[PDB]
Write a protein that binds this ligand. Sequence first.
Ligand SMILES: *C(=O)N1C[C@H](NOS(=O)(=O)O)CC[C@H]1C(N)=O
Ligand SMILES: [Cl-]
Ligand SMILES: [Cl-]
Length: 267
Amino acid sequence: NKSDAAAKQIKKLEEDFDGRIGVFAIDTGSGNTFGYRSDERFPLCSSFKGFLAAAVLERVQQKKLDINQKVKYESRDLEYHSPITTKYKGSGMTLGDMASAALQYSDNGATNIIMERFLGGPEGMTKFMRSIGDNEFRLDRWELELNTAIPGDKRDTSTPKAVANSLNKLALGNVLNAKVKAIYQNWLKGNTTGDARIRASVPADWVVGDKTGSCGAYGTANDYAVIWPKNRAPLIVSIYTTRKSKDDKHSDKTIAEASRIAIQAID
Ligand SMILES: *C(=O)N1C[C@H](NOS(=O)(=O)O)CC[C@H]1C(N)=O
Ligand SMILES: [Cl-]
Ligand SMILES: [Cl-]
C-alpha cells in the first residue's frame, strides 16, 4: 500500500499539469523499488548524454581510445548549444574534457563529434546500451533532431526503469573498473543543469550526481540521479515527463516533486 499511495500522488500530479510522469527509484541498500509508468516510453532528450559519456569511458578502459587524446574540429559548424566546444574550437579538446562537457553542460557539438568519430552514431550508442543489458533504450537520430518529442513517436526513447537500471549498472555496478567508474561519478557529481530537479528534492548535505534532459517541445523534460544520502547506501532516481501540447513548457517543479514522492516510496 505504500507503493499505492505514492502512485495516487504521482497520478494526481501528472493530472494537475495535464501531462505524463514516469518514475523508477531504487534503494541500493535494501533492493526496494518504486515505479509509476515505469515501462512506458519517454523521449531521452539530453539525458542520453550521460550514457554517452559512460560509453566513452568504456572505450578508454578497453584501450580503444585514450582519455587525453586531442580531439580537433577547427573547421566544424558547431550545433546550437555548444557552450563548451565553442570555447575550444581553435585548440581542440581532450577526449575526456569533451565527454564531460557533453554530460555536465549538455554540449551538442561535443555529443555529435563523439558519436560521429568514436561511438558509431546513434546505432553504436544503442549497441553500447544493449551490451550492458539495456533492451529498452534506443537512439535513432543525431542532435538536434533527436529532441522533437512528438507524442506517440518511439524514436529516441527509453523507459524510467531501464534508465534507472542502466545508471545503476554504470555509476555503481561493474561495467567500469574502480578507477574509471570514479571518474564517471565525479562527472555526474559536477553536472551544472540539474539544480531545480532531483537535486532540489533532497537535503543540501546529500551528494548527488545527475543528468537532465529538456527537449524544448511538448513540455518534455527529465532527470536521473545517483544520490549518496549521509550514512546510507546510494539511491537511484529516474523521472521522465511529457505534456499534452506542443508549446507547453517543462515543469522543473513537477520533476522535483515526483522525485520527492518516489524517494519516500522506497524509504
Ligand atoms: C538537452 O536536452 N538539450 C541541450 C540543451 N539543454 O540542456 S539540458 O537539457 O541538459 O537542460 C538545450 C535543449 C536540448 C537540445 N539538444 O536542444
Ligand atoms: Cl535506458
Ligand atoms: Cl538534479
